[PDB]
């Protein structure tokens, strides 16, 4: 299905569009600040998921 | 981490 980026709200450029390992949210690596130059190989959690951690 | 492309 069509996930969208939390920052820019577009679902284009699938190749750069990170999925959150904890929910159905997404972010383009090029929209991320700080600079994310590549798709990380480990788990990645969006900011909404960080809010639920302890 | 997986992308929208690697998941679809
Ligand atoms: Zn974006
Ligand atoms: Zn999340």
Numbering used by the authors:
A (entry chain A): 1675 to 1728
B (entry chain G): 1 to 8
Question: What did the publication describing this PDB structure actually write?
Answer:
The plant homeodomain (PHD) finger is one of the largest families of epigenetic reader domains present in chromatin-related proteins, with over 170 PHD fingers identified in the human genome. Members of the BAZ family of proteins, which includes BAZ1A, also known as Acf1, BAZ1B, also known as Wstf, BAZ2A, also known as TIP5 (TTF-I/interacting protein 5), and BAZ2B, are all characterized by the presence of a PHD–BRD tandem module at their C-terminus. BAZ2A binds to the ATPase SNF2h (sucrose nonfermenting protein 2 homolog) to form the chromatin remodeling complex NoRC (nucleolar remodeling complex), which plays an essential role in silencing ribosomal DNA (rDNA) genes.
The peptide residues A1-K4 form an antiparallel β-sheet with the first β-strand of BAZ2A PHD, anchored by backbone hydrogen bonds with residues D1688, L1692, L1693, P1714 and G1716. However, starting from K4, the peptide adopts a helical fold that extends at least until R8, forming a complete loop of an α-helix. The canonical intrapeptide i to i + 4 backbone hydrogen bonds stabilize the helix loop i.e. T3 to A7 and K4 to R8. Two additional side chain-to-backbone intramolecular hydrogen bonds are formed, one between the T3 hydroxyl group and the amino group of T6, and a second one between the hydroxyl group of T6 and the amino group of R2. Inspection of the binding pockets in each of the four chains of the asymmetric unit reveals that the histone-binding sites of chains A and D are both occupied by H3 10-mer and are free from crystal contacts that might interfere with or modulate the secondary structure of the peptide itself. Conversely, crystal packing occludes the binding sites of chains B and C and no peptide is found bound to these protomers. However strikingly, the structure shows no direct interactions between residues T6-S10 and the protein, besides a potential long-range hydrophobic contact between the A7 methyl group and the L1693 side chain.
